[PDB]
Amino acid sequence: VDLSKHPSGIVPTLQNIVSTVNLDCKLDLKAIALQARNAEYNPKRFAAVIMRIREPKTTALIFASGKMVCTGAKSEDFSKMAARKYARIVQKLGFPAKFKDFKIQNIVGSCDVKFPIRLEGLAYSHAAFSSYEPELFPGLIYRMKVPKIVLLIFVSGKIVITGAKMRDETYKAFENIYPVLSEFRKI
DNA sequence: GCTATAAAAGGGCA
DNA sequence: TGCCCTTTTATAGC
């Protein structure tokens, strides 16, 4: 790992990317669910057609408005690439599908500092950013202000970082928290 | 399973 | 007017 960009020497692994794009045309969801083999639509439950492709492994939520949500990709590039594949399927189904305003909405990453954490102590010292009700959920919820990112910290040293729109925010949030986890290493 | 977290889309309903 | 709901993903205890 480049110790210069990642001083901790640990790089969070990207696990999930959520993006949206505007197909810029109205869609007939019922016609889409009928023609598209790997597409499901239950309006009474959710007003979108749920469609999936194997590569990049992702799930799309396609709306009558032409707007679309892409989930599951492991990278921003994989997410765009997946979103484009769905736009072409929709095009080939007979709709004038474009690719307007593609935007990465959320990036989810995770890593392991490989040492256990004293969550109770970190929670106490960082109370204005922490939420820890172990009887509820075993992880401490750390709502970082700069960058405005949320981290789920576990006793095992495993960390989830979410809410970023740029991978650098994910990286910086982790670099910020790293000395704090060290400060609260369970001995 | 399911507790929790972020985020987007849009229909239903209080 | 505005929350829930659906989907995804890591994490870990119920």
Strand B nucleotides within a 7 Å radius of protein CB atoms: 3-11
CATH tag, A8-18+105-186: 3.30.310.10
Tell the CATH superfamily of the A19-104 domain.
TATA-Binding Protein (3.30.310.10)
A8-18+105-186 and A19-104 have identical folds: yes
Strand C nucleotides within a 7 Å radius of protein CB atoms: 5-13
Find residue A60's DSSP bridge partners.
Answer: A51, A70
Resolution in A: 1.9
Domain ranges in chain A are 8-18+105-186, 19-104
Alpha-carbon distances, residue A34 vs A59, A61, A139, A148 (angstroms) = 18, 16, 43, 42
Q: What is the DSSP string of A104-172?
A: EEEEEEEEE-SS-B-HHHHHHHTTTTEE--TTT-SSEEEEETTTTEEEEE-TTSEEEEEEESSHHHHHH
Nearest-angstrom CA–CA distance, A152 and A162 = 8
Mapping DSSP to helix (H, G, I), strand (E, B) and coil, where does residue A32 land? helix
Alpha-carbon distances, residue A151 vs A11, A18, A111, A159, A180 (angstroms) = 15, 17, 11, 7, 12
Q: What is the DSSP string of A44-76?
A: TT-SEEEEEETTTTEEEEEETTSEEEEEEESSH
Question: Which nucleotide is nearest, taking the CA of residue A165 and each C1'?
Answer: B7
- Strand A100-112 and strand A13-22: pairing? antiparallel
Question: Which nucleotide is nearest, taking the CA of residue A136 and each C1'?
Answer: B3
Neighbours of A94 (CB within 10 A): 11
